[PDB]
Amino acid sequence: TFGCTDSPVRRERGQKAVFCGLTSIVWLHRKMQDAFFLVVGSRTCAHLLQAAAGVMIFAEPRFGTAVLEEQDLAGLADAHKELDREVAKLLERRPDIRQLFLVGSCPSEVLKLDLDRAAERLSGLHAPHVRVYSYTGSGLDTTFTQGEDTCLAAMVPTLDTTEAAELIVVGALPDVVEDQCLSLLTQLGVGPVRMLPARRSDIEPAVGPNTRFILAQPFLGETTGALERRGAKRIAAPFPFGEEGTTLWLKAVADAYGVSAEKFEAVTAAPRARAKKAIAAHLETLTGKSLFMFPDSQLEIPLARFLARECGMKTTEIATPFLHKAIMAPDLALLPSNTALTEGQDLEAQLDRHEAINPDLTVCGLGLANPLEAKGHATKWAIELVFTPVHFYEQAGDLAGLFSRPLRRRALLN
Amino acid sequence: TFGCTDSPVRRERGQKAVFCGLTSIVWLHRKMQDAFFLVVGSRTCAHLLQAAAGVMIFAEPRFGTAVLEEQDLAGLADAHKELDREVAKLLERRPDIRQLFLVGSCPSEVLKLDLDRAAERLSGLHAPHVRVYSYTGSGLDTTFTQGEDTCLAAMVPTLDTTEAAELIVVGALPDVVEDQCLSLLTQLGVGPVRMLPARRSDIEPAVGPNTRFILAQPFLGETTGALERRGAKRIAAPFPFGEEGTTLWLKAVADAYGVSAEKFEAVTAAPRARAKKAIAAHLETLTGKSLFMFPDSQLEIPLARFLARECGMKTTEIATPFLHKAIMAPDLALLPSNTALTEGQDLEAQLDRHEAINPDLTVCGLGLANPLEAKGHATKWAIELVFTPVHFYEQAGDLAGLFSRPLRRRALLNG
Amino acid sequence: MKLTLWTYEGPPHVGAMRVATAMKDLQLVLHGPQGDTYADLLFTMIERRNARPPVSFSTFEASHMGTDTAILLKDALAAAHARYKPQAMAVALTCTAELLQDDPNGISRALNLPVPVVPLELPSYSRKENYGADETFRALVRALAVPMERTPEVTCNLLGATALGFRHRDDVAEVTKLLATMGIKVNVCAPLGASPDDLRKLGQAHFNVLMYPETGESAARHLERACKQPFTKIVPIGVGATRDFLAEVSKITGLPVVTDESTLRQPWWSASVDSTYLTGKRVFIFGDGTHVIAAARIAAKEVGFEVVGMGCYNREMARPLRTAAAEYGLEALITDDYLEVEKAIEAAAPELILGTQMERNIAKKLGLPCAVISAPVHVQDFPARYAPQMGFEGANVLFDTWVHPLVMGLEEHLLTMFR
Amino acid sequence: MKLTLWTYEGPPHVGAMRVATAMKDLQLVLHGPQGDTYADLLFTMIERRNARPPVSFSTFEASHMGTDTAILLKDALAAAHARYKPQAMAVALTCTAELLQDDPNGISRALNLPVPVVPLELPSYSRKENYGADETFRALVRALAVPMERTPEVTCNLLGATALGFRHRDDVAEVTKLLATMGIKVNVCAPLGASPDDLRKLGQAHFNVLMYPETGESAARHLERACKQPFTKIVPIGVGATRDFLAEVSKITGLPVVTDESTLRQPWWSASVDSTYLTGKRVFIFGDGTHVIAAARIAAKEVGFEVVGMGCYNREMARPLRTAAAEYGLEALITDDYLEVEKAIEAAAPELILGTQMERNIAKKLGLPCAVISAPVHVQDFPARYAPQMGFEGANVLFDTWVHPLVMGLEEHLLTMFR
Numbered sequence A: 001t002f003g004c005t006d007s008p009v010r011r012e013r014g015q016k017a018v019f020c021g022l023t024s025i026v027w028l029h030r031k032m033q034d035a036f037f038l039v040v041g042s043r044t045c046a047h048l049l050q051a052a053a054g055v056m057i058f059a060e061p062r063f064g065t066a067v068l069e070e071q072d073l074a075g076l077a078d079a080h081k082e083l084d085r086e087v088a089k090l091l092e093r094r095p096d097i098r099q100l101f102l103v104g105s106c107p108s109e110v111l112k113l114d115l116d117r118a119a120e121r122l123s124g125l126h127a128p129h130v131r132v133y134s135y136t137g138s139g140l141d142t143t144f145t146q147g148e149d150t151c152l153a154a155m156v157p158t159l160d161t162t163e164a165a166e167l168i169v170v171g172a173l174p175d176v177v178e179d180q181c182l183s184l185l186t187q188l189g190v191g192p193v194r195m196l197p198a199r200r201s202d203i204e205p206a207v208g209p210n211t212r213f214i215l216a217q218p219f220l221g222e223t224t225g226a227l228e229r230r231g232a233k234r235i236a237a238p239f240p241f242g243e244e245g246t247t248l249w250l251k252a253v254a255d256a257y258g259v260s261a262e263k264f265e266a267v268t269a270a271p272r273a274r275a276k277k278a279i280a281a282h283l284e285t286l287t288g289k290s291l292f293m294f295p296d297s298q299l300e301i302p303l304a305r306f307l308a309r310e311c312g313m314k315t316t317e318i319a320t321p322f323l324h325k326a327i328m329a330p331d332l333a334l335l336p337s338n339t340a341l342t343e344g345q346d347l348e349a350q351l352d353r354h355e356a357i358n359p360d361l362t363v364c365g366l367g368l369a370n371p372l373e374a375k376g377h378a379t380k381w382a383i384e385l386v387f388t389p390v391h392f393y394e395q396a397g398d399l400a401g402l403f404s405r406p407l408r409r410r411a412l413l414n
Numbered sequence B: 001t002f003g004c005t006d007s008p009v010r011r012e013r014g015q016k017a018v019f020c021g022l023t024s025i026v027w028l029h030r031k032m033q034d035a036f037f038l039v040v041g042s043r044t045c046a047h048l049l050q051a052a053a054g055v056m057i058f059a060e061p062r063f064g065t066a067v068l069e070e071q072d073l074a075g076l077a078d079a080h081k082e083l084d085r086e087v088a089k090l091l092e093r094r095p096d097i098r099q100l101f102l103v104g105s106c107p108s109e110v111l112k113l114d115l116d117r118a119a120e121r122l123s124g125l126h127a128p129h130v131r132v133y134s135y136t137g138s139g140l141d142t143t144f145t146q147g148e149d150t151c152l153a154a155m156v157p158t159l160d161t162t163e164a165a166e167l168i169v170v171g172a173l174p175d176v177v178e179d180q181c182l183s184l185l186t187q188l189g190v191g192p193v194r195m196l197p198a199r200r201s202d203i204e205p206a207v208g209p210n211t212r213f214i215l216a217q218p219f220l221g222e223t224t225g226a227l228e229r230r231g232a233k234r235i236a237a238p239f240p241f242g243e244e245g246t247t248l249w250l251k252a253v254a255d256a257y258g259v260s261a262e263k264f265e266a267v268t269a270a271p272r273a274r275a276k277k278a279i280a281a282h283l284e285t286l287t288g289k290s291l292f293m294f295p296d297s298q299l300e301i302p303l304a305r306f307l308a309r310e311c312g313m314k315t316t317e318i319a320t321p322f323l324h325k326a327i328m329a330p331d332l333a334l335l336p337s338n339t340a341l342t343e344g345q346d347l348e349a350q351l352d353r354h355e356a357i358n359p360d361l362t363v364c365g366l367g368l369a370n371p372l373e374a375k376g377h378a379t380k381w382a383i384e385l386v387f388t389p390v391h392f393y394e395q396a397g398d399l400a401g402l403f404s405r406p407l408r409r410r411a412l413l414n415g
Numbered sequence C, D: 001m002k003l004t005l006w007t008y009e010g011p012p013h014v015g016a017m018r019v020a021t022a023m024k025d026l027q028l029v030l031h032g033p034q035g036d037t038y039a040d041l042l043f044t045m046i047e048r049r050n051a052r053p054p055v056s057f058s059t060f061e062a063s064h065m066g067t068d069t070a071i072l073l074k075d076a077l078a079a080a081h082a083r084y085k086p087q088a089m090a091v092a093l094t095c096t097a098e099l100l101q102d103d104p105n106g107i108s109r110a111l112n113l114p115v116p117v118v119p120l121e122l123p124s125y126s127r128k129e130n131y132g133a134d135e136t137f138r139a140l141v142r143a144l145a146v147p148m149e150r151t152p153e154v155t156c157n158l159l160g161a162t163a164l165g166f167r168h169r170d171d172v173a174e175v176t177k178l179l180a181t182m183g184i185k186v187n188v189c190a191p192l193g194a195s196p197d198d199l200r201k202l203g204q205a206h207f208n209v210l211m212y213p214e215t216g217e218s219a220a221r222h223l224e225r226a227c228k229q230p231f232t233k234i235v236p237i238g239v240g241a242t243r244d245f246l247a248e249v250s251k252i253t254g255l256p257v258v259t260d261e262s263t264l265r266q267p268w269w270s271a272s273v274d275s276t277y278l279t280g281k282r283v284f285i286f287g288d289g290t291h292v293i294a295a296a297r298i299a300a301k302e303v304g305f306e307v308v309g310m311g312c313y314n315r316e317m318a319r320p321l322r323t324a325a326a327e328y329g330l331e332a333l334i335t336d337d338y339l340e341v342e343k344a345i346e347a348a349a350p351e352l353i354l355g356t357q358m359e360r361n362i363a364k365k366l367g368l369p370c371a372v373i374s375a376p377v378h379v380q381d382f383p384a385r386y387a388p389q390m391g392f393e394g395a396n397v398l399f400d401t402w403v404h405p406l407v408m409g410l411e412e413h414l415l416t417m418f419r
Ligand code: PMR
Pocket: A019, A023, A024, A026, A027, A048, A051, A052, A053, A054, A366, A381, A383, A384, A387, C273, C274, C275, C277, C407, C408, C409, C410, C411, C413, D038, D039, D041, D042, D043, D045, D046, D379
């Protein structure tokens, strides 16, 4: 009845409706406060960020694009020298910034612009005030949330050293969700515990051979590598989505740190009781309903697991842009065995399978969402799942609500 | 040739497009800061005020209408009991208010509720903290700005008694303009001086046999009466619109208090020539253009005097709702002696006279403004003139501006 | 006595004025004081017309009362008629004249005019603007309309459209438009645009489209009594309404429902994923009967809002309003006191307000999104552009209007949220 | 290198997409990486369409570079024809793809498809969204239109109307109405609405309406070289320009100018006393060439504003705008840097701003009242309600829109002041 660990997963390239890693800036710049994200790219990349940010663009945010010109395209020794001029000019007019991220785009990568070395020389040139990093967010490398992965993995090698036995919760999460996590972890008697990324450059976590760390977002493969390479050890756990996710999430940290039986139940019961009851309100329109998800964020597998076990949905095809085998093991084993899994995408083919299934609710991209509505399928645009708080106990009612809303709306316009 | 002091004024009545006194409340209440205007009238009265105030209505304004229900028209129905339960319910939530005006309306006049005697009863029940008055702003009694007149006059008998020789400038004048006036008279060495109405209840001026008062607004007939009744003597002036008008106005006072001619010139020349320069800005568009004004506010004659002598316009017919011979004497003696003067109005006949003249510019009310524009006549709506700073030197430029604007808009719209 | 600051409705006689100004070649004479002419500005300034409204006042005052009040009425009528040479006339009382002995009926009849002079019964101390309008129209219709042979071709009248009606202009245009596509030409539109000689030929229509109960109810009812013409009981504001209305018309007549849905966009705008965040939004709906009832169906069943309050200021629509409110699990708020409207909103804690110019201001005071749906209304809501509330284009305009004052998807989740 | 936050225009290919999406039975295949499909959301979100854009990407990534890029284009080209059996197709390069060896032509020839495949040069590092479109349409026209015998009925083509274009939908409707009123019919409207076959037909129309220079100027020129077809040199935005337009269309066709002005309410609106307080208002106008030139005429000549700054972001419209600005004694401000706009507004402190989405956000920041006259724009400026800029109903919409954010006669003279 329950278990997808030995499921064969369709790996599938082709035409792909997805976002590049660039987009991660749109929320990362919010959490990371003394940081600045300068994409080295074309007008196209500026355009994406500008459309993606939406009204955020007018809020004088901490990102921009250094858009390439004809002159920059050819000759690579002048491309680097001109860049440093851009940066110095930028850096000298925003002294509030301590962290600069040179984000790599497709055009920067095709022009073989060594931005890892540009970051290199710029750190030395602008220390002690400003450290500058480099990471890829290009179409050729990244899908949507993988932009956060490469970003953080870039910060890792340069973090501080420590023999301390610290906990690190990895992945940027809304500041509301973050505090809940911190408080529950202090309540269970585990500390000290820092987030990565921290809200500010001065208060970043430190790594050492004794650091345990734990992922809060599933799309954090490269960052794990980075951390394990500095000698920290991961705590494997299902992702904190729903009463069950969060409990099992917190249970792994408890067991890794030696928190007692009663001590867990005591801290956990009340917050749980609450979440289970907020989720009930939605079971109504959700139970029995068939579910299908297009590939986007890598949040599909854990959320699908959640929708099936707590909101009683029946799963059909759950697609992910990339499936990291080991990170996803705890969740995979909890997925309803009937589930069909896909890694990657072929758009034309997947749309054909979609129709054939004809599912009650479809998670999918915004360029895909409206055309599907017109064809008579109810849809829940995926991109919300990153901007809305969703992790841990309080938000678990709201999480379910995200998927009950569109269905309650189609019922309601009839 | 100047001098309309002999010109025969047309006395006329019939269909009339004018506002009642009630509408004075809309500007009056802004200036008296701790007064309240309770109009005892019908839903019409409340509707008018709502329409007049426009957007002011949404700002908890210090006026209201106590509106007559059916049961109130009965012949047992209690006037004294009913109204009082309503004013106490008002003062309960508005402890801030120190002057209460019971404004008379048409409906309350036909039933003849003794509002004047109601003011007494209520003053008794509500002293010391709050004092109440009664005046009429009905359509039967007043036209538009006459509501300021009846109001101010209703206060005069109440005013403290004094033996000082203080100047009273009479007129609800926009605060900015009032300061200017107050300064020029301080500079001239006359004083101290005080306004009626004062910005608050407890700084009203006192009155006595040595008090001299000067009129800043031309529609203060009753207030002149009640003030003269207390022994105060008026100062004869044309009204302080325009550089010339304002100079004459100041000169009247200067003469009255005996200000050395040099001191007058020192104070005056500086902002005099300044104002005059800011009028030449609107001259090309104004000079030669023929002017017609409909009766609205009694501000016609002096503005007509200002538009002819300073802006170079030609008068045709200048009509006023009430022509107070002795007060307008100074202005009438400066009017182009070609001018046709009308006191009152018979709408249809005056429209027939209008068409036949076919004037360049027409000053009129808002119910008349647009219908005239579609007839092809350029129009300037009068209502503005009470709501804009318009008196004294500084706003003299702005005053001419008010009349050049609709003429400039016409040109620049159909070139 | 009632302390009044804001009044949702003018006196009845202003309603009369709304019916006289709507029409052509009709003169209305009010017996009233010098100063009630302020109501002209409503027309020349809000509606912004190019002509003095066909209304004139006896204009009595201090110096001419008693036996003279009666005299002034007479000449007012005499001059009015002699000058404009109207097809027909009305005579009525202002609140202030309602306290006199003077007889509009007797004075009109002793004067003995070459045209009809219809007196009007308008109690100023009980009833308000809407009654005034409805009655003045009823009175006129009762005196002019006479049964006739039906049009050879299938025709109908449009009843209730007045001067200074919130979106009356473009509604008339839009309803004619959809009745045209169904093969029904419009006979007489009244009062709007119509002379009394047009009123004289109401009888030849097959049916009547009762566009506004507030200002047509009584004349629709007389034309059912007298000309055997059924009148429509559904007001086509919104998609569902329009569809029902068209099918009502179909039943009344036998013709098939033929819709041109080619520019109808609201259903899809509402369907799209941009609109999903509208679901469950708590809305408070207030204004006059007709628009409130109409709005709440659009809000609930077409947009996906949740109606959290319903009401109106006109007692004459209380029965229809109550019927509807209960369909939403709500109790109708019937009142004309703006203060009691404000308490209801404060209590209902809504996310959007659909109301009147008064509610626009309560909404701002309270920091709440707001759109106007019903008279009374500032000048902006007499617009230059095509702005119907009725029919298919109405449904577009309504959709546009209502979602305007709200934050969008992106912000909601995330300007000082960033600042 | 050029530091960039805001971007008035997209890359040239997005402009290609506008032409492609505007059309039916046309497939555009774009050579580019995963992710450049973000541009799809512009159409399904903002313009809010019921289907996927007819745009498909080769979708190359890191693990498939080198000689696979070459193969990948081939495959997207095939699949698109196989699946959507389209009448014709266009192929072009993304900014990334422009740094690759792959020949758009040479590949599409080596497939030898049973329909025309039009290659399109799109210089991504020098040109922008508009050129993208203007050229994509040109190529298409140059590829598909041929000389033809004229229609027996006097007919014309509407050129420049695209997907994701500011008020294109309703402009196209209102200009049609204008011409029908003169007894002229639309032969083909392109791109918007047209198919590759519709385009083959272009040559039979008597003349052309250049609706939007920035996106049609090239094709208008070509149709003058190729098929003797003159084109309109005046865009009908504002009452005055419409008159000039119809007068121009008269000389081109020898046809009397017949107009319906029964619904043109703007002249009177602005003429009316309510508007006297508009004379003098310092206005700053920015946007693209077309809408800015047009607005500046309506402001000065039709409403009575005084224009204290004019600019546009599209360089291809620089001399027309500098010519026009001279007429008002201003330096035109040709820039694509919002900070230069921001700086120039600040400098010549207007009382109203007419601009793009950006300008209205600069206006918020400054606390200046502002309305939108031009692309780029947010989703609320693709309204469900009818809302042209062009012609008579456009002139009404324009009036209502611009006057809205102000402060009317009274308060000036307010809720703060009274507060
Ligand atoms: C780059 C393409 C693009 C476009 C055209 C839109 C339009 C749009 N996106 Mg947005 N959006 C794009 C992309 C993105 N959006 C993003 C976010 C986002 C959110 C959270 C939301 C949103 C929305 C929109 C909207 C609706 C307008 C609004 O923001 O209220 C448009 C036109 C809006 C919505 O209604 O979704 C259904 C909403 O809640 N966008 C993100 C996150 C990084 C990206 C990359």
